Every structure is written in C-alpha cells, then in structure tokens.
Amino acid sequence: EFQDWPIVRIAAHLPDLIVYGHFSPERPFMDYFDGVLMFVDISGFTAMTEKFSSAMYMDRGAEQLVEILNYHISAIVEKVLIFGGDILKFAGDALLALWRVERKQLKNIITVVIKCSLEIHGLFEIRVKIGLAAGHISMLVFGDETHSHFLVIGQAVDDVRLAQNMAQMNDVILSPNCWQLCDRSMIEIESVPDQRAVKVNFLKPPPNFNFDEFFTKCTTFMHYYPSGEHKNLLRLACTLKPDPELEMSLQKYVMESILKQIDNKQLQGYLSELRPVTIVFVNLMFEDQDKAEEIGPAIQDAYMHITSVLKIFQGQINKVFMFDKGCSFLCVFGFPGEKVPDELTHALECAMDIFDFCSQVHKIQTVSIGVASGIVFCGIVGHTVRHEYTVIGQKVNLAARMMMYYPGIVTCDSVTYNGSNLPAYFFKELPKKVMKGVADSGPLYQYWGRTEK
C-alpha cells in the first residue's frame, strides 16, 4: 500500500480530533465531549538547547539537537499512540494527549492511560513528569478563510493543568475528578499535601486481570484505533487517500513553510536551525466565571486582528495554548524566510497594536505581551507519523514568563530594547522580579509607546 501522499504528510502535523472532524465553516466552531487528558513535561529541554548552541557542536548544533530530541520524544509518542491516545499538540517543553470516549468508559480508559503513563516513565531510567485528568472537554476551532487553529478548553483541561504543576520528576498525578472517576480497586495512590489531587504509586490489578485482553476490549471504544489489516500502523491517518476538500481544510492548520517542504519544494532539513528571532508572546486573560461559549468569540475576534497585524509586520503564529484561564499566542518574527533588518522595531509596534486592539475586545479582561529576541532552536519535533514545527530556547521561555509576571502591559528584554531603532523614552525600565527558571534575564523594559498616554 502506497501511503506517502501529500494529504498524509499534512495529517502528520495534526491530531485525529482534526483529521477526522467534520466542522462547519462557522468560526468560532465549538464542540463538546468527554475524555481523558495526559500532559507530559520533559525536563532538560531548556538545559540542552543552550548547550547545543555551544561552539563544541561546530555549527551542527541545531541538527544534533533535533536528532537527540526526536529520539526521546518519538519514543513517548509511540507509547501514546499504541495505547490509543491522540497527541493534540507539542510545545518545546511538553505534549498534551487525549483519549476521547463515551462517559461510561472513562473509568476503564483511565486505567489504560495510567498504564501508558507508567510505561512512559519506564523509558527513562533525562526524565519526565505526567499529569492526568478526566471529564468534560470543549474544543474550539478559530481562524479565517485560509488559516485554522484549535484548542481544548474546560473542566478536564483546567484539571490536567492543576495535576501537571504539582508533579515532580517520575510522578504520575491524578486530577481530583480523575481520582473520583477511576477504578480505585486497581490503583494504589498517595495523598499529596495541601491538595485534593493524588499521586499514583502502583497499578495493582486483580489476579484474574489480563491487561492485553483488557486493552483489546477498550479498543472497542476507540473509533480510530488501527486494526484488522491496519493493525501494525501507528495511525489510521497513514491510510488517508487523496481528497481535495479534506486536504483543503487540513492545510489551513499548517504553516506555509511546512507546506512547501511537504510539497518537496524545499530541502527537508531547511527548517532545523538555530536562528535569531523575536518572540512575541501574547496572553489573553478571561475571568474565572467565563464559559467556553463566550471565550470562543473573544478569541476569534482577537485572532482576526492578530493575524492581520502579523502579516503587516511579517510575523507568524507558531503555537496557540490555553490554561489558567489565559489564551496565549506564540508569535515569531524572523522565521526561516522572513528576516528584515528592522525586525525589532516591527515586533514592538506589532505588539503594541495587538495590545491596543485586543484590550478593547469584550470579555478579554487583560492583555499581556512579552517580547524577547535572540537565538532559538527551530525544527520539526516528534515522530515520523506525528510531529510539529516548534521553537525552543531561553528566549521563548523568557517571553512567556514576562507576560505572566508583568501582566497588563507590553514588556521586552534588553536585546530588543537596545537593538530597536526607537528612542529610549518609548520605554520604561522595570523592577526586575525573580522568575521561575529564568536566570537573570538582563534588564527588562515596558514598551510605553510614542506618547505619554
């Protein structure tokens, strides 16, 4: 069976949630379902990226880094996939997976997903941290006529965020609702101080229990688990055949430079690089009460403005995420074929413009934007059959921490400040705060703009 069609290469960049969806053209588009979520945090992906920028790697640092990264990440991905999970998104520091099932099956699937989590830790004995949640999930699709983005939002998402930030290395933490829904007969746990979540210590199945048979019966409930003559494929998406309307929808989710590689119009290694870029990390905050029905339209309206300004200032959205009631856009200036000599001025002017517009979007409570510039790793991270263009580096992390620790304003780092072709009074030096995992930032600045108010 031939399976290397463009439509299949595109599907590698996308989860089944999207590949096998049937969304209306309305934007935003929202659907609702139940599932189990797994969030995997890898530690070290910070440490080593800065190591691979060393002269030791003789200008092959990016190539060496993506190689060892994909070696470790693709092992996690195939464990997720063989246990029937759908990898939703990659960040440089993590991936989020989903088991979507009917509510009656959540209890059994949690057991599957806990075994899956234990075998992932078994790969590394470099380490990982895992948080699990279960419950209601809302999916949000937003975009315009040529670009689409998705998010998951809701109960189980907020819960998986809770569980993930308590975990330490080698932990598997269960959401309070996952603990309440799971088969406590079979899972041995320990309480975590000052918390209602639990840590999983052991999986203790009854004497009769056979996990392989158990798993096989659970695949009964997985619509897209490969079986029969496709039982040794990692994804059913590998079997997709050419279908112009489906490819038309799917390609809207993928950045243009990726599509050019998919079409064999660019060397397949062109996108692995340590490159100077400016990161513009945009956070849109909503109130705790807000429902997904109201968040979706706000994000759509914000997005319609973000995308138009990015095009003017030649930036791109690399990743969208949401947690802690905040939707964040990882924007990048100076991507593989998009470097300009006034890049820094443009990143700030684009930030300020995004700030001013989104701050007048109804239901958005706070806009916060961090700007940082420097060498970041760029590349396609994951497994052959499931992977995504991602940016990694201290500057990515610094921009993200700035928008968190300095809410409601536009901040920038010292590189962006000194290297902008703007006068100093457009800026304000800021009190330097201690920030998680950020070792002396340098001086930071608020981008005040051209006039006092």
Ligand X SMILES: COC(=O)c1ccccc1Cc1cn(C)nc1-c1cc(Cl)nc(N)n1
Q: Is residue 277 a contact residue for ligand X (CB under 6 A)?
A: no
Q: Is residue 321 a contact residue for ligand X (CB under 6 A)?
A: yes
3-class DSSP state for residue 178? helix
- Which CB, 390 or 441, lies closer to ligand X? 390
Name residues whose C-beta falls within 8 Å of residue 171's C-beta, 6 or more positions apart in sequence: 129, 130, 199, 200
- Distance, in Å, from the CA atom of 155 to the CA atom of 160, rounded to the nearest integer, reads 9
Q: Is residue 153 a contact residue for ligand X (CB under 6 A)?
A: yes
Q: Is residue 400 a contact residue for ligand X (CB under 6 A)?
A: no
- With contact defined as beta carbons under 8 Å apart, do 5 and 130 qualify? no
Tokens of 418: 């000194």
Q: Is residue 347 a contact residue for ligand X (CB under 6 A)?
A: no
Which of 150, 225, 281, 427 binds ligand X (CB under 6 A)? It is 150
Q: Is residue 329 a contact residue for ligand X (CB under 6 A)?
A: no
- Distance, in Å, from the CA atom of 160 to the CA atom of 131, rounded to the nearest integer, reads 6
- Which CB, 89 or 275, lies closer to ligand X? 89
Task: Report in angstroms how near the CB of residue 322 gets to ligand X at its nearest.
Answer: 3
Which of 298, 322, 347, 403 binds ligand X (CB under 6 A)? It is 322
What is the per-residue DSSP string for 76-104? HHHHHHHTT-EEEEEETTEEEEEEE--GG
Task: Report in angstroms how near the CB of residue 208 gets to ligand X at its nearest.
Answer: 36
Task: Report in angstroms how near the CB of residue 374 gets to ligand X at its nearest.
Answer: 21
Residue 320 backbone dihedrals phi, psi, to 5 degrees: -120, 140
Total chain residues near ligand X (CB under 6 A)? 19
Q: Which region, judged by CB under 6 A, interacts with ligand X, from 159-167, 188-196, 388-396, 429-437?
A: 159-167
Q: Is residue 164 a contact residue for ligand X (CB under 6 A)?
A: yes
Task: Report in angstroms how near the CB of residue 286 gets to ligand X at its nearest.
Answer: 12
Q: Residue 124's Cα: distance from chain center in Å?
A: 22
3-class DSSP state for residue 151? strand
Task: Report in angstroms how near the CB of residue 52 gets to ligand X at its nearest.
Answer: 21
* CA nearest neighbour of 175 among 114, 229, 231, 122: 114
Q: Is residue 258 a contact residue for ligand X (CB under 6 A)?
A: no
Q: Is residue 160 a contact residue for ligand X (CB under 6 A)?
A: yes
Which of 10, 18, 38, 88 binds ligand X (CB under 6 A)? It is 88
Q: Is residue 13 a contact residue for ligand X (CB under 6 A)?
A: no
Annotated binding site for Mg(2+): 41-42, 93
Tokens of 283: 């956070």
Which of 89, 275, 386, 401 binds ligand X (CB under 6 A)? It is 89
- Which CB, 66 or 295, lies closer to ligand X? 295
- Which CB, 321 or 357, lies closer to ligand X? 321
Q: Which region, judged by CB under 6 A, interacts with ligand X, from 157-165, 228-236, 246-254, 340-348?
A: 157-165
Which of 18, 69, 81, 96 binds ligand X (CB under 6 A)? It is 96
Q: Is residue 286 a contact residue for ligand X (CB under 6 A)?
A: no
**Crossing angle of helices 61-82 and 106-122, rounded to 10°:** 140
- Which CB, 13 or 89, lies closer to ligand X? 89
DSSP letter at 394 equals H
Which of 69, 95, 173, 317 binds ligand X (CB under 6 A)? It is 95
Which of 5, 51, 74, 94 binds ligand X (CB under 6 A)? It is 94
- Distance, in Å, from the CA atom of 249 to the CA atom of 23, rounded to the nearest integer, reads 10
**Beta bridge partners of residue 139, listed in sequence order:** 31, 152
- With contact defined as beta carbons under 8 Å apart, do 314 and 407 qualify? no
Q: Is residue 299 a contact residue for ligand X (CB under 6 A)?
A: no
- Which CB, 161 or 395, lies closer to ligand X? 161
Indicate the residue type of 119.
E
Task: Report in angstroms how near the CB of residue 366 gets to ligand X at its nearest.
Answer: 18
Q: Is residue 151 a contact residue for ligand X (CB under 6 A)?
A: yes
- Distance, in Å, from the CA atom of 414 to the CA atom of 305, rounded to the nearest integer, reads 27
Annotated binding site: 41-46, 89, 93, 129, 152, 161, 322, 391, 397-401
- Distance, in Å, from the CA atom of 401 to the CA atom of 67, rounded to the nearest integer, reads 27
**For the chain, first and last CA: distance in Å?**
64
- Distance, in Å, from the CA atom of 327 to the CA atom of 354, rounded to the nearest integer, reads 14
Q: Is residue 292 a contact residue for ligand X (CB under 6 A)?
A: no
- Distance, in Å, from the CA atom of 277 to the CA atom of 329, rounded to the nearest integer, reads 16
Q: What is the maximum span of the chain, computed from C-alpha positions, in angstroms? A: 74
Tokens of 47: 């440490």
Binding site for ligand X (CB under 6 A): 39, 88-91, 94-96, 150-153, 157, 160-161, 164, 321-323
